[PDB]
Amino acid sequence: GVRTSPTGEKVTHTGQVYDDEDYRRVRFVGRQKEVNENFAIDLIAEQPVSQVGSRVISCDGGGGALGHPRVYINLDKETKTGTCGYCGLQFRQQH
Amino acid sequence: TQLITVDEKLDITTLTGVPEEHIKTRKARIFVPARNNMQSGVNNTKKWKMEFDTRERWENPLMGWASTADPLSNLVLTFSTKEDAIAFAEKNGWSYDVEERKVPKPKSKSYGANFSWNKRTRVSTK
Amino acid sequence: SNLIEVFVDGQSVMVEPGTTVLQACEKVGMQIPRFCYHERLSVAGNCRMCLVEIEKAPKVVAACAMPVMKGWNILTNSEKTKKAREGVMEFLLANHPLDCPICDQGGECDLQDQSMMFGSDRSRFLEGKRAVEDKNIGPLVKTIMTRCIQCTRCIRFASEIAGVDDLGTTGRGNDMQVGTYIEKMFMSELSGNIIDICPVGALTSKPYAFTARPWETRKTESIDVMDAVGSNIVVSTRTGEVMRILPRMHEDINEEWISDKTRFAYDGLKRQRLTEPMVRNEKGLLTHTTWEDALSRVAGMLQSCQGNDVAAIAGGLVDAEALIALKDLLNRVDSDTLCTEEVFPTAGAGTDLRSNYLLNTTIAGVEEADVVLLVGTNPRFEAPLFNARIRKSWLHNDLKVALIGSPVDLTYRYDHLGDSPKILQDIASGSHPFSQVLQEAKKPMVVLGSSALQRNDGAAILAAVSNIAQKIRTSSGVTGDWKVMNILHRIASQVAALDLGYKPGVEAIRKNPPKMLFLLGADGGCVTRQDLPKDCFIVYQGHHGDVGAPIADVILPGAAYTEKSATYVNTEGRAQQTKVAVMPPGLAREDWKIIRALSEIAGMTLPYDTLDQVRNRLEEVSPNLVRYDDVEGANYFQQASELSKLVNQQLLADPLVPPQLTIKDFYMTDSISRASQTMAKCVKAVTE
Amino acid sequence: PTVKPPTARKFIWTNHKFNLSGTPQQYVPYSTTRKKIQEWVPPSTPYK
Amino acid sequence: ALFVHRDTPKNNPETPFDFTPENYKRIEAIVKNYPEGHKAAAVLPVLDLAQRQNGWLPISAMNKVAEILQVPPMRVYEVATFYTMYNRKP
Amino acid sequence: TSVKPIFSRDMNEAKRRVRELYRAWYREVPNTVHLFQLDISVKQGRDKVREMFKKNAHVTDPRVVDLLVIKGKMELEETINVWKQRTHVMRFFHETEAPRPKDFLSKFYVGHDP
Amino acid sequence: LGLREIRIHLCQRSPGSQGVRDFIEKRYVELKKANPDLPILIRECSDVQPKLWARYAFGQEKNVSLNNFSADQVTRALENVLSSKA
Amino acid sequence: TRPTVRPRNDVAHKQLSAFGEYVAEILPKYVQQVQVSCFSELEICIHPDGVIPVLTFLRDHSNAQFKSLADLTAVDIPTRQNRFEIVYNLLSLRFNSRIRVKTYTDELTPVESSVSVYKAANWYEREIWDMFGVFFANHPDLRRILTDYGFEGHPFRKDFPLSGYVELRYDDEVKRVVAEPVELAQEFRKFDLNSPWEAFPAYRQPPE
Numbered sequence A: 001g002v003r004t005s006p007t008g009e010k011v012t013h014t015g016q017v018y019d020d021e022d023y024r025r026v027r028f029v030g031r032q033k034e035v036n037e038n039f040a041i042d043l044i045a046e047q048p049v050s051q052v053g054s055r056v057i058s059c060d061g062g063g064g065a066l067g068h069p070r071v072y073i074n075l076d077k078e079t080k081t082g083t084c085g086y087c088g089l090q091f092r093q094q095h
Numbered sequence B: 001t002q003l004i005t006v007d008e009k010l011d012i013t014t015l016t017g018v019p020e021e022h023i024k025t026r027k028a029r030i031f032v033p034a035r036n037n038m039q040s041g042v043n044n045t046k047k048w049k050m051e052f053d054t055r056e057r058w059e060n061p062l063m064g065w066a067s068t069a070d071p072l073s074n075l076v077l078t079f080s081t082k083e084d085a086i087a088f089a090e091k092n093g094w095s096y097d098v099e100e101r102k103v104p105k106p107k108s109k110s111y112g113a114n115f116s117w118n119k120r121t122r123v124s125t126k
Numbered sequence C: 001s002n003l004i005e006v007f008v009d010g011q012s013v014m015v016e017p018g019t020t021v022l023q024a025c026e027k028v029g030m031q032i033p034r035f036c037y038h039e040r041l042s043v044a045g046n047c048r049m050c051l052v053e054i055e056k057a058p059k060v061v062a063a064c065a066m067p068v069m070k071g072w073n074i075l076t077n078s079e080k081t082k083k084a085r086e087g088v089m090e091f092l093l094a095n096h097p098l099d100c101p102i103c104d105q106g107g108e109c110d111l112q113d114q115s116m117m118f119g120s121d122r123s124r125f126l127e128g129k130r131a132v133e134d135k136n137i138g139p140l141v142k143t144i145m146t147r148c149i150q151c152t153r154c155i156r157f158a159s160e161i162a163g164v165d166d167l168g169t170t171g172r173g174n175d176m177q178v179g180t181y182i183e184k185m186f187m188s189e190l191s192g193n194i195i196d197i198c199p200v201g202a203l204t205s206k207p208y209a210f211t212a213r214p215w216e217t218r219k220t221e222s223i224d225v226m227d228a229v230g231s232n233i234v235v236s237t238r239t240g241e242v243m244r245i246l247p248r249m250h251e252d253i254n255e256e257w258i259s260d261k262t263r264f265a266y267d268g269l270k271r272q273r274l275t276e277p278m279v280r281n282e283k284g285l286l287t288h289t290t291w292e293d294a295l296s297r298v299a300g301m302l303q304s305c306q307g308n309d310v311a312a313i314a315g316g317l318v319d320a321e322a323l324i325a326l327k328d329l330l331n332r333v334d335s336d337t338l339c340t341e342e343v344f345p346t347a348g349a350g351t352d353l354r355s356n357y358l359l360n361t362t363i364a365g366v367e368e369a370d371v372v373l374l375v376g377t378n379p380r381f382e383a384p385l386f387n388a389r390i391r392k393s394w395l396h397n398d399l400k401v402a403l404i405g406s407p408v409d410l411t412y413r414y415d416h417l418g419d420s421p422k423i424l425q426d427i428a429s430g431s432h433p434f435s436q437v438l439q440e441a442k443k444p445m446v447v448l449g450s451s452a453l454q455r456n457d458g459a460a461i462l463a464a465v466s467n468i469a470q471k472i473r474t475s476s477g478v479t480g481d482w483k484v485m486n487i488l489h490r491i492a493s494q495v496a497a498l499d500l501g502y503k504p505g506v507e508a509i510r511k512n513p514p515k516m517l518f519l520l521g522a523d524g525g526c527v528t529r530q531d532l533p534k535d536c537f538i539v540y541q542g543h544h545g546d547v548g549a550p551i552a553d554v555i556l557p558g559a560a561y562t563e564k565s566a567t568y569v570n571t572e573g574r575a576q577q578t579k580v581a582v583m584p585p586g587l588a589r590e591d592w593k594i595i596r597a598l599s600e601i602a603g604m605t606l607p608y609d610t611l612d613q614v615r616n617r618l619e620e621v622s623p624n625l626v627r628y629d630d631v632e633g634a635n636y637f638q639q640a641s642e643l644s645k646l647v648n649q650q651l652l653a654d655p656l657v658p659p660q661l662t663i664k665d666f667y668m669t670d671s672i673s674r675a676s677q678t679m680a681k682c683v684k685a686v687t688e
Numbered sequence D: 001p002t003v004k005p006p007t008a009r010k011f012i013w014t015n016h017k018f019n020l021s022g023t024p025q026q027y028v029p030y031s032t033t034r035k036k037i038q039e040w041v042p043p044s045t046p047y048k
Numbered sequence E: 001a002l003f004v005h006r007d008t009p010k011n012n013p014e015t016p017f018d019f020t021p022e023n024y025k026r027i028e029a030i031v032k033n034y035p036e037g038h039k040a041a042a043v044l045p046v047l048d049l050a051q052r053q054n055g056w057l058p059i060s061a062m063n064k065v066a067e068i069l070q071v072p073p074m075r076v077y078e079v080a081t082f083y084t085m086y087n088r089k090p
Numbered sequence F: 001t002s003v004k005p006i007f008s009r010d011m012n013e014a015k016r017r018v019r020e021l022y023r024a025w026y027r028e029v030p031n032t033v034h035l036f037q038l039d040i041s042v043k044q045g046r047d048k049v050r051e052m053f054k055k056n057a058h059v060t061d062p063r064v065v066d067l068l069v070i071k072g073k074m075e076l077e078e079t080i081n082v083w084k085q086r087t088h089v090m091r092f093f094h095e096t097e098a099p100r101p102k103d104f105l106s107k108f109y110v111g112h113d114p
Numbered sequence G: 001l002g003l004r005e006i007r008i009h010l011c012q013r014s015p016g017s018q019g020v021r022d023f024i025e026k027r028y029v030e031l032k033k034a035n036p037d038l039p040i041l042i043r044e045c046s047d048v049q050p051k052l053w054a055r056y057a058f059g060q061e062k063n064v065s066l067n068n069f070s071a072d073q074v075t076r077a078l079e080n081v082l083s084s085k086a
Numbered sequence H: 001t002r003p004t005v006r007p008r009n010d011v012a013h014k015q016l017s018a019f020g021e022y023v024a025e026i027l028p029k030y031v032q033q034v035q036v037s038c039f040s041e042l043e044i045c046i047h048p049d050g051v052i053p054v055l056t057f058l059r060d061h062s063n064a065q066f067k068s069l070a071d072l073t074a075v076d077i078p079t080r081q082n083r084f085e086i087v088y089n090l091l092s093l094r095f096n097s098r099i100r101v102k103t104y105t106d107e108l109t110p111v112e113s114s115v116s117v118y119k120a121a122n123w124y125e126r127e128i129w130d131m132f133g134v135f136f137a138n139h140p141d142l143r144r145i146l147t148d149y150g151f152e153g154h155p156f157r158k159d160f161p162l163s164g165y166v167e168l169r170y171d172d173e174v175k176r177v178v179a180e181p182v183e184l185a186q187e188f189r190k191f192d193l194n195s196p197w198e199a200f201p202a203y204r205q206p207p208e
């Protein structure tokens, strides 16, 4: 979900864009500002919330030893989902 | 004889190759560094340290990196006693300031004080 | 002496009876590992990491709790001591989450460090771990309770030091959870210090969260200026940017704590900042300019002044270097009218004797008193670690506290005598029962807060309180070494300004208003443009644009307390120097550099060039502003008592009401805190 | 990759680009953080 | 089964709880069993009395025990979650 | 305060060695300006030699000035034998460096350095 | 044009400040009653020598060392400072 | 303690302790300490007036025959008043053994050059002049060996900064490689890595 300043410059997933009166836009004159158009904050929002029947879930990001350190997430709050701290996949107790 | 007598003050500022700006404008700080209150270990409070005053760090126009012009901005020296650090600062012509070692004063700890009969020092829970 | 001889690994040490095993091993330089023992909290004995072998004893003892008996040989490095340490570290790492990379405690964790030192290097735990529901205890302390090792430093801090009694353990067994049990917002004035003493990342700093990491931070040891306590701090920075503020241990001030304002107002230090000199353009608007233009337009008006044509107001956050700089600059113009915002009465002795404007006993001397009388102050929010020291004396020494003023909450219990100042006449006449409580006390203590001196009868309140203090000290069982009369300040610049000889309060400017006004950080709004003449030439020198920078004609952007080495004197008279952590942003300079450059542009150049020459001048004006971390005692209470009897100023009938009643009024006091978004979230959290 | 294809993802480049150095499509570096210190904005109203 | 509290409309500090006057006399008889200055020692009986009048413990019986015994409410919450007889659900 | 010397027993032999090193540099300067084909005059290089000798004139320790004479003989040996290039000889003349602010006011204007 | 402030520095425990202490224990109050609109800043410190700073008009500060004086010598030097106004 | 722990060599420890007693009692005029490490390396800490009489002994004595100078080293330790620690590493090919001869000096005291014993030392102690500033008396050709020709200061001194004080660049105005005061586009980031918990209780120093 890349957006654009009034200067025409693309805003990154950080939120970085130069000011209009900043001289350092001259480095992109005749060249391009390389941004990545796959924003991870939007791509993890696209993932569905996993309904599990347990009270404590374990996440390793998939792949076993190719993901992250395995963590255990508590699902006793019903207002909030249980979000993994590494991969951002969020879980919910189904009851 | 084979030994001469030099009753002058020990000064080696002409031999260290340090420019004048980084001798006569710097303020060395001789100090025992405080314990990080994130932790309870005290092994970093055991020795004296000599550092210098921080100079300007600015933004690199290309990357935003911390550009410096202070060569002595990373120089931290380790000394066993205060007087060794003072002698090393005086030998190099560094004007210094010394902070005294702040050891914690001893406490009075009583586990039974948590459960007293008439004193306010009872714990309300345990 | 009654010292008993014990042995640590064979080496003898002589200890007082009541010394624990941990302290006995401390006396020979060995630190027994611990998680729940804290030397400023009570002994819990419930992490079992300090289990150590006493020889000829087939059981490990809790070294934090077990007192030494005579003749014990403590085996801190023996086989079963190390087996006990590895077993206890194994149980601590059984259910602890694999969160070290996503944790703010990584690299500064006790559990990591003494797992590397005293535990095993691998797991036998083949089960699934627990996961604990997190809590919301405020906008300051991020809570991840899965990391909690259940050591109850939460509870001992919030009970004993913070005086809150609202953290505790619910549940039982492995399901035991530290929390408030309800959706409760733990916002004390010392609520961020549980971020310190939590050994794990269960309680982290929510503003500091994720931004830095401890090994890459440079540690600059500096001074708090958010009040007049003078808390020693560490400004930890990273690549020229302030990351956070930690406490330093100082046994006589702040023991190892800081307030929430100190801990979390460093982000107002990066908003609303004055970075370039500003002058008024042809349309009457502040526009950016160079230093040459701004210093010339100030110095051309300074050359056209003489006498009472020029005056100065000193704000709440100004170091003694800039204070004596601007004093010398205005004394070249023959102007004595240099003022502070905070009003101290000039009646009687005034600011001549230091003893009638200091915390003369000490911050440490609260531990030696038996009766403390707090007059007109709410010291929980005016000097929160001074109130922490009163609470520690209340807890461990059975201190009797009475308050004359509005019935505020002080986290302990006191004798509320009432809020009228005529009670001060009743105690000094013996008609009040607390007067006999003062007379039969060996070490009395009378603390008149400097916010009560902001009233119009502040000279009369000071005279009545000093009348009480000299009624007690000249007659009762006070030796002479003990100091009774004490004044608690709320402004870090105030005591250093009074030692240099400023005229406190702006009545010297309200008397005859000048046509040119310097404002060293003067953001209290005490003198606005309705008090000045039609076109006064107002110069603001400071680091934030809050109050005085809009009304200024020329803005001189200065340095903050993290941006200069700078002498600040606390409420007890101790002078203390800050250190340069970062440099001022943009074109802003150090404050006395600006005043000295203004003196050279004006042609009234001052006899200093370096900071050492400023401090030689500062020693010339009073020689105790350069002897750092020293409390110089001030005598001559009897002479100021005799001078205070000259004017019979009347006590007003208005009740003694401090301006900071609840936690709502604590977070935003000066221009750094008002610019702080963290203080904004704290106010928004406590007003709902 | 005809026999054992690579595992597909929604973020892998469907169009492989060659070395763009020397072209107007080349990489220009920049600080990907925002501004640290915020400056004071003076009031746009007069002061009399 | 939980040991945190969430405010439901049937369990909140606005749930009505008050002792009967015979229960206040029973509470005074309980408090007179303990030394002066240790009124907190009546936390476990009186709270159990608050379970006998009501059948369970909402978070108004815990706060009422905390109010009439002059103890902090967390020190009653700890007792009500530590011991297995105190029904924190109806 | 009884230390082992380097070459000199007191300051008089030390000043003798300083003086002979100065003679050797003074004789060497025209050869250095010729064979490095420096764009300075001979008088300018001799003024630089006088400057480098007056910079260390405050020293009263015989061992310290013996080491200064030893390092000056090393620099002279690197000069006579063509071991330095033209660049190493012209590094005594800080010619690409802009002149530093000296008084208080210009140092105030440029930055934060004292 | 006139005297603006007086600064008296001294020690708490040094014998050389003793007469200066004897000046303030006995003779400061009737001094301060004689000069109500004059700041006479008494500054005690740990190991300083006695000293008498007198700031006059336009930043001029004269200095008189008061080391090893009696109370009468401090009185005479201070009344010379008061009657000087230079 | 078999698989992951280094095996202790008690035979070599006893032999090196005996030969250390031997050297300490043959040469008591200069030997100040003799110590043997737990991994069995013998150090003979001597007085700096006996650099030549000790080293000529170990090179020539029939029970020593340390015919090889493996390495010669200085170590800057600024907390000592004699901050430089000159370290000789010697190899006896006859007895298949190594010894370490340690001594000390400050900036101003000269050490006698050991080229009269080991000509191998001709560059090594010359490097000690270049990197540390220790002067060696009666050296054949003592000058710099590793630094640039106009280099001011001795770099391996611990008060000398990591980057220097100057840096080079080509300047096309003067058509010359020039030196300027050092400015780094990114500063070297200093990492405070030391844990506050004691790592080795055997090496604990007694407190004050």
Ligand code: SF4
Binding pocket: C096, C097, C098, C099, C100, C101, C103, C104, C105, C106, C107, C109, C110, C111, C112, C147, C199, C200, C201, C202
């Ligand atoms: S609290 Fe310590 S052990 Fe636990 S995840 Fe954080 S750094 Fe690791």
Ligand code: SF4
Binding pocket: C147, C148, C149, C150, C151, C152, C153, C154, C155, C178, C197, C198, C199, C200, C202, C203
């Ligand atoms: S949150 Fe931290 S301080 Fe509190 S009990 Fe748990 S580990 Fe201890």
Ligand code: FES
Binding pocket: C033, C034, C035, C036, C037, C044, C045, C046, C047, C048, C049, C050, C051, C062, C063, C064, C065
């Ligand atoms: S430290 Fe003694 S048991 Fe926790």
Ligand SMILES: [K+]
Binding pocket: C105, C194, C195, C196, C197, C198, C199, C200, C201, C202, C203, C204
């Ligand atoms: K923590």
Ligand SMILES: [Zn+2]
Binding pocket: A059, A060, A061, A068, A084, A085, A086, A087, A088, A089
């Ligand atoms: Zn995950």
